[PDB]
Amino acid sequence: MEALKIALLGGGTVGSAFYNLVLERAEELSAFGVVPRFLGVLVRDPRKPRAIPQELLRAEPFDLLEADLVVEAMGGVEAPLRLVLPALEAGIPLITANKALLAEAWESLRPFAEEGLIYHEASVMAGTPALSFLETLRGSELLELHGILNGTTLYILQEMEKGRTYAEALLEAQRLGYAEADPTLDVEGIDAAHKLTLLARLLVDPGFPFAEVEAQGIARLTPEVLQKAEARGERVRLVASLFGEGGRWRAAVAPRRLPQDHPLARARGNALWVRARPLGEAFVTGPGAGGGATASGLFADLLRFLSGAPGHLPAPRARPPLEEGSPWPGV
Amino acid sequence: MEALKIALLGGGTVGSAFYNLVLERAEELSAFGVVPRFLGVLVRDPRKPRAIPQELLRAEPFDLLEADLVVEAMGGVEAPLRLVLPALEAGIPLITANKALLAEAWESLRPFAEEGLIYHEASVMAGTPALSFLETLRGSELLELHGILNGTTLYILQEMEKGRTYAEALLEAQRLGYAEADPTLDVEGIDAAHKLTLLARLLVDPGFPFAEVEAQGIARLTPEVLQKAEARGERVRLVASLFGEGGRWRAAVAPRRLPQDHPLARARGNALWVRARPLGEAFVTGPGAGGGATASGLFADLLRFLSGAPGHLPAPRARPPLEEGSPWPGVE
Amino acid sequence: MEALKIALLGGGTVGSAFYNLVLERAEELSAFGVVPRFLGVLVRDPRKPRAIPQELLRAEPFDLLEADLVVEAMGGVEAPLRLVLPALEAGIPLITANKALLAEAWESLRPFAEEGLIYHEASVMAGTPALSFLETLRGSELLELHGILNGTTLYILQEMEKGRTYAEALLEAQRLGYAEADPTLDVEGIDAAHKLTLLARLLVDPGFPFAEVEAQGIARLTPEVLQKAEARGERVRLVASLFGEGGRWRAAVAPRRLPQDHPLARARGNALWVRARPLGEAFVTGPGAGGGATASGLFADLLRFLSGAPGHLPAPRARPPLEEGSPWPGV
Amino acid sequence: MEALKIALLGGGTVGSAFYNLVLERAEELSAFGVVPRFLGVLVRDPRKPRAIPQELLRAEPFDLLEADLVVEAMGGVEAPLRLVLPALEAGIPLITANKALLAEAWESLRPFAEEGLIYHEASVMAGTPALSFLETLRGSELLELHGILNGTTLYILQEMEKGRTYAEALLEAQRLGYAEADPTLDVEGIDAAHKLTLLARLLVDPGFPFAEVEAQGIARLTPEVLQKAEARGERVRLVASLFGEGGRWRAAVAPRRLPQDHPLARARGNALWVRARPLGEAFVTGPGAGGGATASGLFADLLRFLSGAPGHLPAPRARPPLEEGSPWPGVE
Ligand code: NA
Ligand code: NA
Ligand code: NA
Ligand code: NA
């Protein structure tokens, strides 16, 4: 039996659910040979009501070099980056839910990802299998990938289908915890674009640049646009696509018209659909946002680490696209 | 005495500061023959402790068309846009602090700005005069404009000079209320870009596109870079610049090496510096973030309206730069 | 028109309701010739969610000597005392809801009360008239005073009559905001004793010592004890009494058996009953706890001050009891 | 493996620390062949953010009689008393931190303490050994006992020495979690009195009455009184004393002038100092407030129970003091 000393960065909805999940499942962890010992939880305001015991909270950065593991679910990019890098340079692994971080600081983070120090299942579709789904898909070669990767924009579209306005639906999405007070990253497709980047790096190109993704959000959509789609036997969804074009991989996020019985259109939750050679057509669905769903992913990654398995590796080298085969209707 | 009927969108840090500031100032408002009456306050979570009466809280959108004013202090672009448009279409003015809305939804909002229906002093440098400052600078032709527009990135650089790390300073900037939980828009220069666009539109080109601003944040900066600048007699700041290059106006946001005695380097707060002909060199400084600071600007605009003055107009035409210019050196 | 600069001490339920009430009624205050300007609000944790704008909060003591008025609704005795004394010595008035303070620090506070610098209607029966009720009763001489002065213990007794247990009722009282997490002062009769002391000082003896009050709380009471009272045509209430005995004033708090149709037994809320010569029998009832009820009292006192009227003065000299006349059944 | 069924009363700072500490230590508990299972957690407000699962929260009292243990960390006396009595009557042990309950409801609780059913290490100096410390000191006859028992009043004096005012220090003591919103019980010496009573009952008189302790708080103290003590080579502390006078044990709480080199004056935390015959002079120090510190004591008691040991017993008889003693000088 050994102690697993954990530094948690972020005590929001994600960080709180992960804290409580770790302790609630400490009986599982002992089967893996450890007892969880949180060193501290970096938070913005330590005197705010929060579902973590108050004495464990830290308003200021603390030394991570004594941790066995860093778990991060902070907002943003540069501050978490600067906090995690000294831990990663010391060979301490990182489990993170921070898709922005990984999408936007990859020049700094790739060498540690290549060494198996970064676990980030929770950074795409929360605790729904997504990174692991693509790790198994690596048996095949990708022909086309389409996902519905953001929870907020799925929620808003579903509600606008029912005749709720954008604003009404957004307010609801904010109360359910899918969206922040400023939902810009969600509703402009940028969160889908960060997640799409990460999918690309795992499966097809370990250098894929976030800046190459072409992203458009849901701003042109209204209940009318959606009802008319429905009349045409279609549903409109914000889709994240990865496909070959003129010999290179291209990534796009945009509203797309789907057949109404397509797996993407029907899905229970966020979804990832792929067509690959020789496997064929495969699909995964589940919750893509929320504290408990995200914490599940972080905890799956902690078990992965405890079992002796390395983190999520980028593709070992860029793969060649097979189909230039390049799909679509936009709205 | 008559009611001045206000619909308020947003009951957070700004919207609550504004609401309580309006109540404080009810005696001042009676000097225009009005009493402030709120039709409703749009908020996300009606359960949260809030210095606004529970009975005025609205968790869902409410009809705006009886208002005399809509005041908006929500986050993001599209939802505020869709909420305000029917009021603007009805000829109801909008008072807003939402620099992103204005920068990014200008195709929709420009016509109403042209009719005097949009008041937005608080969208740049909060209640520090910035838009009014340029309104007065219209008396000259612009040579160049350089501003330190974002509160969070000023604060973080100020702290890093003193030896603090980025993350320490950020966290404090967040506790102070300059930066949100996700401060990406601040620290990547995007907030300064949004503000820069609005200054360009007021002064020199009423169609100036947000997408044309070149923006880069503070992510390459550290206490050691700032300390080496200091030993060279410089200060590094994130600067928003508007200047002529090749006969076209160029807008950029980037870290710049300033002479340490420059007004911009010595700024008490956020700052806007402007050389124009024939005036010369003028400068304004003051707080550029914060609940009260922002509410001061919103309320300045309410008084502007009540006094009979229209909102902030775009430049009446675009025109080319009078002279070729250049910002300070960037950071190597 | 002038500015009224206010320092508020305490931003709890009382301090928050008083802040918001002052601004909501600023149109009234302008009729009194002022505009309210809060200097700052002393709070324990300034980053806690609170119904006061965050920038006005102060985690540390601030200079009061620039205020026109101090309003205090802090817990406890010695800290508020030390905070208010320099303001009182500078001739700045105090409006307070803090019955403990006044009951327990009267050696320090009496000289300022005698000068009309302390307003404390809200310290007894919240914004229900109580101090003002006794100021008018001063036309007569007191024969006997009986009050039901604590909200929590009234609430618990009322609920236990209906068959709710003590603990159940207390938990409820805590959610309604009558009682704190540790309700000891309420349920031991000590809060009634502080309030009774203050009533005594106003009407009968400006030196009345808090330490002379004989207090017993509600610990012997159960739903059974109460149901049996009801069977005897009685109600049991915790009563605060002031009466003459052997030539002196005596004050007691204790459970007492009341006739069920007595005004004290029926009262809508907390209550004060008096029999005085020559007026006769008079009575006042209303809410005795809660943020809005307390804020009402503080604001009544602010209007009192703004109108030019002094604070609540102690009796000018101890009065002689007329009846030694000394009542009771205990339980 | 079997369930150790726990009913927890209180989900605040202590009860939440305790709950999470138990979950942390589930591996340690398996070494006794048990897994911790909570029947319910009694809390005031089930809506508040809390590190305990929502489904275990109980806003109303719940049946305790299936528990193997009741752990209590509520405030006040009567309501906890009425909640725990039926469990004690059923032979279910109580683990508690509630010094007021024990001090003030002893007529009801003494019989159960005599049967080994009450564990209360955390009721004095939190998880710092205090009750176990006296259990071992039973090997001698008590000469005198002097303790610095309250965390808030130690903290405030420590700060006032350094020049802080009372109110500044208090507010920080409250933010640190030593003192509640109303800190009257701490600062008036009543909490130290409650603790002193319990030490007396364990050591010298199982019926010792709380009402016989003479208590006086820190209200006469200021930075200037403490600074004058320091210039005389002294430190002023609030001390809880048990000592013989006139053949009877006397219990007092008051400010005392200590020699600055005395163990009590130099205490790292709250402290308990004891001269006894034939042992000599013994001393224990450690944190005497705080969520984690308190939970450590509660959990120590859980382990004591699980290991087969009974709770803290009162002294088996009363007896008179062996010698006539005296505390330090009070503060002039
Ligand atoms: Na996932
Ligand atoms: Na401005
Ligand atoms: Na009253
Ligand atoms: Na202890």
Q: How many CB atoms lie under 10 A from the CB of residue A118?
A: 25
**With 0-12 CB in 10 A as exposed, 13-18 as middle and 19+ as buried, what is B314?**
buried
- Which chains touch A (3+ CB pairs under 8 A)? B, C, D
Chain A residues touching residue C48 (CB < 8 angstroms): 47-49
**Alpha-carbon torsion (A108, A110, A116, A121), positive or negative:** positive
Smallest CA–CA distance from A47 into chain D, residue: D175
Burial annotation B114-144 (CB, 10 A radius, 16+ → b, else e): eeebbbbbbbbbbbbbbbbbbeebeebbbbb
CA–CA dist B184, A78 (Å, integer): 8
Closest partner CB to D291 (pick from A37, A49, A55) = A55
Q: Phi then psi for C167, rounded to 5 degrees?
A: -60, -45
CA of A218 relative to ligand 1 center, distance in Å: 23
Closest residue by Cα to residue B86 from B57, B115, B112, B123: B112
- Of D5, D162, D195, D228, which one is the catalytic site residue? D195
Calpha distance B252→B238 (Å, rounded): 10
Q: Does the annotation list B294 as a binding residue?
A: no
Q: How far is the CA of C121 from the centre of ligand 3 (A)?
A: 4
C-alpha separations of C24 from C27, C29, C35, C53, C126 in Å: 8, 10, 12, 14, 19
CA of C289 to the centre of ligand 3 (A): 10
Place of tokens 């030196």: C207
Burial of B32 (0-12, 13-18, 19+ CB in 10 A): middle
User: Which of C45, C50, C57, C60 is most worth mutating to test chain A (most A CB atoms within 10 A of its CB)?
Assistant: C45
Q: Which residue has the tokens 């529970």?
A: B54
As beta bridge partners, residue A38 has A6
| Contact (CB<8Å) B291/C55 | yes
Q: What six digits make up the tokens of A146?
A: 């389409």
Helix (H, G, I), strand (E, B) or coil at B204: coil
Give the separation between CA B62 and CA B57, rounded to whole angstroms.
Answer: 10
Return the H-helix or E-strand segment holding B4: strand B2-9
Q: What is the rounded distance in angstroms from the CA atom of residue A190 to the CA atom of residue C73?
A: 49
List binding-site positions of A for L-homoserine. 180
Instruction: Write the CB contacts of A287 (distance below 8 Å, at least 6 apart in sequence).
Output: A125, A126, A127, A128, A151, A269, A270, A293
Ligand at minimal distance from the CA of B119 is: 2
Q: Residue B180: list chain A partners with CB under 8 A.
A: 75, 180-182
d(CA D149, CA D289): 9
Could you tell me which residues of chain B have a Cβ less than 8 Å from any Cβ in chain C? Answer: 13, 16-17, 20, 23-28, 30, 35, 48-51, 53, 175, 177, 290-292
DSSP bridge pairs for D119: D95
D56 to each of C239, D238, D291, how far by Cα in Å?
Answer: 39, 40, 20
Let me know if A1 is exposed, middle or buried by CB neighbors in 10 A (0-12, 13-18, 19+).
Answer: exposed
Nearest residue to A213 (alpha-carbon basis) of A250, A255, A256:
A250
- Among B113, D185, A101, residue whose Cα is nearest residue C182: D185
Q: Determine whether the annotation assigns residue C11 to a binding site.
A: yes
- Write out the E strands in chain A: 2-9, 34-42, 57-58, 69-72, 94-96, 118-119, 141-148, 214-215, 234-245, 248-259, 270-277, 280-286
Annotate chain D with three-state secondary structure: CEEEEEEEECCCHHHHHHHHHHHHCHHHHHCCCEEEEEEEEECCCCCCCCCCCHHHEECCCCCCCCCCEEEECCCCCHHHHHHHHHHHHCCCCEEECCHHHHHHCHHHHHHHHHCCCEECHHHCCCCCCCHHHHHHHCCCEEEEEEEECCHHHHHHHHHHHCCCCHHHHHHHHHHCCCCCCCCHHHHCCHHHHHHHHHHHHHHCCCCCCHHHCEECCCCCCCHHHHHHHHHCCEEEEEEEEEEEECCEEEEEEEEEEEECCCHHHHCCCEEEEEEEECCEEEEEEECCCCHHHHHHHHHHHHHHHHCCCCCCCCCCCCCCCCCECCCCCECC
Output the CA–CA distances (angstroms, integers) from residue A214 to A76, A279, B28, B118, in the order listed.
20, 28, 51, 32
B28 contacts in C (CB within 8 Å)?
35
> Would you call A86 helix, strand, or coil by DSSP?
helix
Which residue from C minimizes the CA distance to B22? Answer: C23
Give the whole-angstrom CA distance, residue A21 versus residue A36: 11
How far is residue D242's CA from residue D246's CA, in Å, rounded to a whole number?
13
Residue A11 main-chain phi, psi, to 5 deg: -125, 30
* Residue carrying structure tokens 């229900």: C128
DSSP H helix total and E strand total for chain B: 13, 12
| Distance from residue C5's CA to the centre of ligand 3 (Å) | 24
**With helix as H, strand as E and coil as C, how does C157-187 read?**
HHHHHCCCCHHHHHHHHHHCCCCCCCCHHHH
Which residues in chain C have Cβ-Cβ distances shorter than 8 Å to A43? Answer: none
The sign of the torsion formed by the CA atoms of C46, C50, C56, C62 equals negative
Beta bridge partners of B248: B245
**Structural tokens at position C13:** 């339920």
- Considering the domain B138-286 in this protein, what is its CATH number? 3.30.360.10
Residue D215 φ/ψ, nearest 5 degrees: -125, 140
What sections of B43-188 are H helices per DSSP? 78-89, 99-104, 106-114, 131-137, 151-161, 166-175, 184-187
In the numeric block, the tokens 């009005």 are attached to B34
Would the CATH topology of B1-137+287-332 be identical to that of B138-286? no
Instruction: Assess contact for A124 and A198: CB atoms under 8 A.
Output: yes
Torsions phi, psi of D48, nearest 5?
A: -70, 145
**Helical ranges in C25-67 per DSSP H:** 26-31
Q: What is the CATH number of domain A1-137+287-331?
A: 3.40.50.720
Among A1, A26, A54, select the one facing D23 at the smallest CB separation.
A26
* D141 annotated binding-site participant: yes
Contact call for residues D187 and C76 (beta carbons, < 8 A): yes
> Token digits for A163?
């005749």
Contact C47 A48 (CB under 8 A): yes
State how far the Cα of D184 lies from the Cα of B185, in Å rounded to an integer: 48
Question: Residue C324 in 3-state DSSP?
Answer: coil
Catalytic status, residue B195: yes
Determine the Cα–Cα distance for residues D152 and D289; give it in Å rounded to an integer: 8
Please state whether the peptide bond connecting residue B263 to the residue before it is cis, i.e. omega within 30 degrees of 0. no
Strand order through the sheet with B2-9: B57-58, B34-42, B2-9, B69-72, B94-96, B118-119
Pairing of strands D248-259, A234-245: unpaired
Q: C-alpha C20: how far from its chain's center?
A: 21
Catalytic residue among C5, C162, C195, C228: C195
| Helix C151-161 × helix C223-231 angle, to 10° | 70
Whether D66 and D33 have beta carbons less than 8 Å apart is answered as no
Q: Which positions of A are catalytic?
A: 195
C47 → chain B, closest CA residue: B175
- C-alpha radius of gyration, chain D, whole number: 20
**Distance between CA atoms of residues B313 and B119, nearest Å:** 9
Residue where the block lists tokens 């808003």: A156
Q: Compute the distance between CA of residue A39 and CA of residue B250 in angstroms, rounded to an integer.
A: 50
Q: Read off the amino acid at residue B176.
A: L
SS3 A305: helix
Tokens 């903290």, residue? D155
Residue in D104, D41, D216, D61 with CA at minimum distance from that of residue C187: D104
3-state helix, strand, coil in chain A (%, to 5): 40, 25, 40
CA B202 to chain centre: 13
Cα separation, B170 vs B177, in Å, equals 10
CA distance A63 to A39: 10
Percent helix, strand, coil in chain B (nearest 5)?
Answer: 40, 25, 40
Do residues A105 and A82 touch, judged by C-beta distance below 8 A?
no
Q: Please report where in the chains the tokens 């010698």 appear, as a residue.
A: D323
Q: With an 8 Å Cβ cutoff, are C23 and B27 in contact?
A: no
Structure tokens at C252: 């007691």
Phi-psi region of B269 (alpha: psi -120 to 50; beta: other; left: phi over 0): left
Kind plus residue range of the DSSP H or E element containing B118: strand B118-119
Do D127 and D291 form a contact (C-beta atoms < 8 A)? no
**d(C-alpha D7, C-alpha D66), whole Å:** 9
Q: How many CB atoms lie within 10 A of CB A48?
A: 16
Cβ count near C199 (within 10 Å): 25
| Cα–Cα dist A205/A198, whole Å | 10
CA–CA distance, C232 with C73 (Å, rounded to integer):
41
CA of C125 to the centre of ligand 3 (A): 4
Instruction: Show the DSSP H helices in C90-179 as ranges.
Output: 99-104, 106-114, 131-137, 151-161, 166-175
Amino acid found at B277: R
From D29, D62, D71, D200, select the one nearest D131 (Cα to Cα): D200
Pick the closest to residue B83 from B104, B60, B103 (CA basis).
Answer: B60
**Superfamily (CATH H level) for B1-137+287-332:** NAD(P)-binding Rossmann-like Domain (3.40.50.720)
Q: Phi/psi of residue D288, each to 5°?
A: -120, 15
Please name the method used to determine this structure: X-ray
Tokens 């969600």 locate to: A186
Domain boundaries, chain A: 1-137+287-331, 138-286
Buried b or exposed e, range D51-68, using 16+ CB within 10 angstroms: bbeeebbbeebeebeebb
The C-alpha angle A81, A85, A86, rounded to 5 degrees, equals 140
Is A45–C47 a contact, with Cβ atoms under 8 angstroms apart?
yes
The pair of three-digit structure tokens given for residue A242, joined into one six-digit string: 């990865």
Pairing of strands D270-277, D141-148: antiparallel
- List of chain B residues whose C-beta atoms are within 8 Å of the C-beta of residue A184: 75-77, 100, 185
